[PDB]
Coordinates of C-alpha atoms and ligand atoms in Angstrom, one line a residue:
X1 CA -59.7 -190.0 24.2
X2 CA -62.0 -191.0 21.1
X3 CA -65.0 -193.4 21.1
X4 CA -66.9 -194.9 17.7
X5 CA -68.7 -193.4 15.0
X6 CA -72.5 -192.5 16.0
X7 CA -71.4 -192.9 19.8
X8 CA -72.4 -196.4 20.5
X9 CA -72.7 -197.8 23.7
X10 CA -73.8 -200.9 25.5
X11 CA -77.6 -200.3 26.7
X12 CA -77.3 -202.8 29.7
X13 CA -74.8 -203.5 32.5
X14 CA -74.8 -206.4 32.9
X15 CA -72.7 -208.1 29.6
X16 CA -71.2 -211.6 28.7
X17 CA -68.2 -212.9 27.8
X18 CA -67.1 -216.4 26.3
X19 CA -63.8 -217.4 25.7
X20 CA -64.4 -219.1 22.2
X21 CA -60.6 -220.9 21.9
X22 CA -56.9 -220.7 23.4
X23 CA -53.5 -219.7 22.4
X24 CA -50.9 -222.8 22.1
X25 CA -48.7 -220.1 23.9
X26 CA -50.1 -220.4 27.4
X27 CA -52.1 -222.2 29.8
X28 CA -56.1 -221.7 29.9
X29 CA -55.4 -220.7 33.0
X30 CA -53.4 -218.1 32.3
X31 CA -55.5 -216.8 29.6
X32 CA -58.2 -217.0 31.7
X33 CA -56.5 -215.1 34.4
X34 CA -55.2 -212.0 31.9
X35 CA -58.8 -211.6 30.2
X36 CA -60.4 -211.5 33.4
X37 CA -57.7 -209.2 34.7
X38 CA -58.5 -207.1 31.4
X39 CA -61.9 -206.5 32.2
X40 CA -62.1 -205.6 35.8
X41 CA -59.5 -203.4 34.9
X42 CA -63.3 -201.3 32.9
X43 CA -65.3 -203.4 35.7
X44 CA -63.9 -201.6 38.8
X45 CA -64.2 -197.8 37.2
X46 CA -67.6 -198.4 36.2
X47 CA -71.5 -200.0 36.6
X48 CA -70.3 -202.8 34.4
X49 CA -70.8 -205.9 35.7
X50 CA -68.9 -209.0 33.7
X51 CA -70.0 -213.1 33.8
X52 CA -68.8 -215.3 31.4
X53 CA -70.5 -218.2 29.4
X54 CA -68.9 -221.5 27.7
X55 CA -72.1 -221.7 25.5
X56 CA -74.2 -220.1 23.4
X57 CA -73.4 -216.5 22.1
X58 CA -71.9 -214.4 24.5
X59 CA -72.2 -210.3 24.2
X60 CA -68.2 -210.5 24.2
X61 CA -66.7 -213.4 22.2
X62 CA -63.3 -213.5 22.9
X63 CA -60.9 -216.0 20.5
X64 CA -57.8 -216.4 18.8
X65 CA -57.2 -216.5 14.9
X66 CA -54.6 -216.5 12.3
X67 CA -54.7 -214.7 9.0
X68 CA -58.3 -214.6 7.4
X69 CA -61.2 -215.8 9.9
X70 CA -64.6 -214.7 9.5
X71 CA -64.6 -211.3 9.3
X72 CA -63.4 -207.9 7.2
X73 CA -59.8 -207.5 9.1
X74 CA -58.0 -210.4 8.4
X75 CA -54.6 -210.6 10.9
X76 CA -51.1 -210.1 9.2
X77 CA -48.9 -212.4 10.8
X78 CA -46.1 -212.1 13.4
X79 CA -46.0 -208.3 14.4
X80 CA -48.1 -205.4 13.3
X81 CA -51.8 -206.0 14.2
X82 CA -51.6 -208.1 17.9
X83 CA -55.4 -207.9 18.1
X84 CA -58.6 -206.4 17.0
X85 CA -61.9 -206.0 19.1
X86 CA -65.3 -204.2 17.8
X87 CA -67.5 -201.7 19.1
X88 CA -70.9 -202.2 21.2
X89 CA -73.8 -204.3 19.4
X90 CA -74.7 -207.5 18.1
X91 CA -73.6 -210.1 16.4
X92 CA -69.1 -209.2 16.1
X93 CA -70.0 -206.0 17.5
X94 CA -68.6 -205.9 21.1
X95 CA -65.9 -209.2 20.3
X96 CA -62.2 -209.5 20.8
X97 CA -59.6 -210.7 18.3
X98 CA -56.3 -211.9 19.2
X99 CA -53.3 -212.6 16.3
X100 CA -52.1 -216.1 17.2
X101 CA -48.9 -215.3 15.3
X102 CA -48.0 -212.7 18.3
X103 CA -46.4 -214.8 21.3
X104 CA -48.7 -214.3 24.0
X105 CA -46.9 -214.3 27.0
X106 CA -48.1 -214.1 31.2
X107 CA -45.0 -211.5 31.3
X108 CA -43.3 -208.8 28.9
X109 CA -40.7 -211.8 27.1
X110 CA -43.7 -211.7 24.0
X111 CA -47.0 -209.8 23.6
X112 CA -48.2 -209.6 27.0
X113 CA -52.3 -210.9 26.7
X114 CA -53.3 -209.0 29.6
X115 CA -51.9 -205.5 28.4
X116 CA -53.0 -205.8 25.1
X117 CA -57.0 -207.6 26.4
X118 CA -57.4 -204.7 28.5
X119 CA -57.3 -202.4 25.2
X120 CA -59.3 -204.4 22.9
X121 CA -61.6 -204.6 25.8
X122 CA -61.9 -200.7 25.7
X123 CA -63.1 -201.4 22.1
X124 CA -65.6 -203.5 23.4
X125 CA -66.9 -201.0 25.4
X126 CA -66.8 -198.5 22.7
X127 CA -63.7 -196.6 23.3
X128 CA -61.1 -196.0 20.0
X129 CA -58.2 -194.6 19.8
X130 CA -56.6 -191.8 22.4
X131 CA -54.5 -188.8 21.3
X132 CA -52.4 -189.1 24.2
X135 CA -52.9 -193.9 27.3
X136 CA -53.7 -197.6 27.6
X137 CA -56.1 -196.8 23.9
X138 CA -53.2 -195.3 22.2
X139 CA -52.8 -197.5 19.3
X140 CA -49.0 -199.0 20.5
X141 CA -47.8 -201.9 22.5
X142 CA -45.6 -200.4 25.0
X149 CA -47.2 -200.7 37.8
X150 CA -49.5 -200.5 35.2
X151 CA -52.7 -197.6 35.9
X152 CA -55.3 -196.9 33.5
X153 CA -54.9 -193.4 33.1
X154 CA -56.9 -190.4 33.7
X155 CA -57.1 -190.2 29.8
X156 CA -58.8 -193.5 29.8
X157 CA -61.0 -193.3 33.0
X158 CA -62.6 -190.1 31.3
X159 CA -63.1 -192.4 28.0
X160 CA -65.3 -194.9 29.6
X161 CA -66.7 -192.9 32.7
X162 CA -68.0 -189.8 29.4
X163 CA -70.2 -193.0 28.4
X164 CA -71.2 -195.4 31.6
X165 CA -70.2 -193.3 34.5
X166 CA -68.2 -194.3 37.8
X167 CA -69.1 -196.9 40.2
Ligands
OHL201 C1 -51.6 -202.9 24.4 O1 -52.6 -202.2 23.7 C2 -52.5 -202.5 22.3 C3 -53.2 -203.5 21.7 C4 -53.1 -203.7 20.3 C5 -52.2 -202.9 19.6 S1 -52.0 -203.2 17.9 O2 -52.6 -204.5 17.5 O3 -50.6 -203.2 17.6 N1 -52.8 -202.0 17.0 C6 -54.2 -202.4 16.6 C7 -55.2 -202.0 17.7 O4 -55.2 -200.9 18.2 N2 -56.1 -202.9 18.1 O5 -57.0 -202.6 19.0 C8 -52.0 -201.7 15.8 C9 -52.4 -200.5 15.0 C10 -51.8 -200.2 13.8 C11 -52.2 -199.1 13.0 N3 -53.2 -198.4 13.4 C12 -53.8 -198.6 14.6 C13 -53.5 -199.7 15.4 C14 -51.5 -201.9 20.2 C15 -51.6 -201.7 21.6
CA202 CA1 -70.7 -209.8 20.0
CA203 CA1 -50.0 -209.5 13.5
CA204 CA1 -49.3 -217.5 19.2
ZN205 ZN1 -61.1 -210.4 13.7
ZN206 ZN1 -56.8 -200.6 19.3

């Protein structure tokens, strides 16, 4: 596994999470359902603690864009880049993007939300890149793996 540059962490345990907009590709419900699938997926193999917001700034602003939108990385259209999320801190630091030119789909037909949530999610937590692997860098019975559960337990611990 890898984490980020300068080893940055969340200092609490207790973070939030707001769901900012929704893709045209699903229900809320649905999206609701994979991105809080996504994080107990980090919530169960840790202290972590999630609650979400629908005001205000949340810790963990979770949204869908196209193209340019607000930051460095703009998205590149259908394929490539399915989503971006950045490590602990404030303000973008710790918040997920999503490429709204990737079909998000509740199964594996297009880019399933849930799969690729739970690995911008590790970015949120401050976990890059594995050499190995849900934070290997490519969208392909799902387990986080041993790879991944010494990632984020070499930074919060277990339960
Ligand atoms: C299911 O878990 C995912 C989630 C997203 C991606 S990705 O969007 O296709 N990935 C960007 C990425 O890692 N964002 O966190 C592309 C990439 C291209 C070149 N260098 C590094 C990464 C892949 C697997
Ligand atoms: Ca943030
Ligand atoms: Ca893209
Ligand atoms: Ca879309
Ligand atoms: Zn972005
Ligand atoms: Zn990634």
């Amino acid at each position: 596994f890898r984490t980020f540059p300068g080893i940055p962490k969340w200092r609490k345990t207790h973070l939030t999470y707001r769901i900012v907009n929704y893709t045209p590709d699903l229900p809320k419900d649905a999206v609701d359902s994979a991105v809080e699938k996504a994080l107990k997926v980090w919530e169960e193999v840790t202290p972590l603690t999630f609650s979400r917001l629908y005001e205000g700034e949340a810790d963990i602003m979770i949204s869908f864009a196209v193209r340019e939108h607000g930051d460095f990385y703009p998205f590149d259209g259908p394929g490539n880049v399915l989503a971006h999320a950045y490590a602990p801190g404030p303000g973008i630091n710790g918040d997920a993007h999503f490429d709204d030119d990737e079909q998000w789909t509740k199964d594996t037909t297009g880019t399933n939300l849930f799969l690729v949530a739970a690995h911008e999610i590790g970015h949120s937590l401050g976990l890059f890149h594995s050499a190995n692997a849900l934070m290997y860098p490519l969208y392909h019975r799902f387990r986080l793996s041993q790879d991944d559960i010494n990632g984020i337990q070499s930074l919060y611990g277990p339960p």
